[PDB]
Design a protein around this ligand. Sequence first.
Ligand code: CSF
Length: 378
Amino acid sequence: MKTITLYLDPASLPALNQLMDFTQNNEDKTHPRIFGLSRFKIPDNIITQYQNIHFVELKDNRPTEALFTILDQYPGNIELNIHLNIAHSVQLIRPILAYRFKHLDRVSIQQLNLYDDGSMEYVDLEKEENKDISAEIKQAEKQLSHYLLTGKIKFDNPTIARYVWQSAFPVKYHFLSTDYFEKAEFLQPLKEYLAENYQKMDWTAYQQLTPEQQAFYLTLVGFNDEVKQSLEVQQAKFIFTGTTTWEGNTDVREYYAQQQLNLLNHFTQAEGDLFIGDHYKIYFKGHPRGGEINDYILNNAKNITNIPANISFEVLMMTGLLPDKVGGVASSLYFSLPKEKISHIIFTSNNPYVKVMRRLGIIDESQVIFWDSLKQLG
Ligand SMILES: CC(=O)N[C@@H]1[C@@H](O)[C@@H](F)[C@@](OP(=O)(O)OC[C@H]2O[C@@H](n3ccc(N)nc3=O)[C@H](O)[C@@H]2O)(C(=O)O)O[C@H]1[C@H](O)[C@H](O)CO
């Protein structure tokens, strides 16, 4: 009798897509919505415009028990419209399925919309190169049935399991690279299975919105006039892109900071192996979770312009503000960049990430550079 919409993501790229869906549907002010986005905070003056709007924390890649308190407020027949991170889909839906068990008479799942975490899904798929993919799919379907019927998780192939939701629900997949599913010949049985249930992430969606909706969207993603003006400068531009480590430990985080600064110097100094030229204006776009690694760059480099780390690179493409050249450590941002704009991509210290980028033609056949092979300058 009533639809409720849920938006869930611990990372960056699925949340960016989901905030576009919310913008497209923003005229309806009373439609029930539940936001679980770890990296995005919806501004207060947008929140006040809406009724039946809710928020939930994620812990260990799943909504917390606070979800159940929200759902208890809707005592009629309810249908759930769910948006999810692909790599983390099994854990993110876990508490939703548990609630459904308790209220079988009134709670149903209407549909799923799923979006890539990023490079993770592709590096993971590359590791499956030698397997019988057709057989893997049939087994994953069986094991998904057990999850839906019992509530217990056990998959022989956690990677392939991410792609079999259509056997239970109406679904739509949104991929960072549809080309990968064409070019990886071993994956043909998966492409065939998915049929009409997938599309590429649509980076032209912003252009189709009204002026009012475009402003609404830029507010959601943290884009502001000051950043816009810094990129409208009349000079050739280079953006240095940063990385992070999910290692908590001090020793590794400090090493990443040191090697990343040395890498910057190889682009910007005359004696550097990757010298771009004296005529470029230099920018820094740190990783959203770089933390102290980002601070090390700003503290120890000179003549560099910061772009706030929380702003997703892809927003620059949407707004038509891409620079001449882009360089740094391998990132998901490089998957949707025009090839003319790539300077050098460096890998961290046969490598599956290297293989993925080679298949897609993002890098060529020449020997790749790992950052521990670079001379310590100065
Ligand atoms: C293989 C693997 O594990 N890939 C994951 C990936 O699926 C995803 F979890 C993420 O993707 P990652 O490639 O870092 O980049 C994801 C998105 O973050 C924004 N971005 C990133 C870097 C930057 N300098 N400016 C930006 O704006 C862009 O919107 C981009 O599309 C992530 O944390 O979201 O982190 C990586 C790695 O764990 C990480 O790179 C550390 O090695």
